[PDB]
Write a protein that binds this ligand. Sequence first.
Ligand code: 29A
Ligand code: 29B
Length: 337
Amino acid sequence: RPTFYRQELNKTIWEVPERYQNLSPVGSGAYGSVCAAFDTKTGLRVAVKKLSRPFQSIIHAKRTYRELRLLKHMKHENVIGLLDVFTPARSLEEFNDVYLVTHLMGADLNNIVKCQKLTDDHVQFLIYQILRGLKYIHSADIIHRDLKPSNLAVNEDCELKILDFGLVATRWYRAPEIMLNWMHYNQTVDIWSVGCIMAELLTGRTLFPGTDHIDQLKLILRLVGTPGAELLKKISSESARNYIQSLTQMPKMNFANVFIGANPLAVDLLEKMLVLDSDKRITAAQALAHAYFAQYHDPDDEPVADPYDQSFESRDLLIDEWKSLTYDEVISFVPPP
Ligand SMILES: Cc1ccc(C(=O)NCCO)cc1-n1cnc(OCc2ccc(F)cc2F)c(Cl)c1=O
Ligand SMILES: Fc1ccc(-c2c[nH]nc2-c2ccncc2)cc1
């Protein structure tokens, strides 16, 4: 066990191994506090995330386990992975804090969009990276569900990694079927989000800036049209059909006209990602092969993930049990070296 050192940063206590120096708060990492730091052992700048109240309730305990399991599984260039995981606790009974560390990226997609006009060439590279990461995540039967600019970390080399997977209004990038509360959505809910993100990078404005679930749905339908007959046939909810069918019917817009001066190849891809009926949307794998990514696409360098065991998701355990499982995972961790 390494030697730990304690300090206080913004009301939060940080007890980390001496190997990590110069901790500096950067922001909220979704249910956790994050500090940029220097890893004296590797010489790399890293981000360290301290989970907040990891075992406060059964929900928190299961979420803590879930996050650790997901991070230990992800080993891809465009997906946040783990360099180290630790706790200052010397025993299970004492175990009450979890710290996760990854390579520091330093910015998010929003820090690249605001008052900044990216070239079509840049959009190709950024979206290519998101899709390469999604192909990997999706191959593990994991759905991100909340893809947005703030969950896309980007470094100075314009390299990108997806963070907060499987765990700036969030509603703006949500698939319409989610706004409708459909419980049987598929992985293309993530493709919808990519489409909203790509459109935003090309235009400089949020594609669908809804003020609530209702407004969000309305803005989406104005562009992609209200449901056609084939899609309407798939809606089981009487209440959903009443609301949707009572709306003034709207045709799908042209897209070539909506996105006027954008690369026609980008418009074509946008049409395939933003198809209303989720069963007709392009997959991450198919998108990678689209002509828009010709200068980046390589089928031999777009890896799939090893199988991921999500069976625990259906289990109802006690807090102490989720805690013990998480402790087991912290101890069995083997760093990249
Ligand atoms: C998205 C962002 C924006 C700006 C800055 C930043 O340094 N700027 C200062 C304030 O904006 C840092 C970040 N930023 C935030 N979280 C990051 O990772 C969180 C994280 C996830 C999993 C782990 F296992 C360990 C972690 F720690 C990274 Cl890897 C990052 O890069
Ligand atoms: F207004 C609507 C109606 C339907 C969708 C929708 C898009 N893809 N799949 C569905 C869907 C919704 C409910 N049940 C089955 C499919 C979205 C918004």
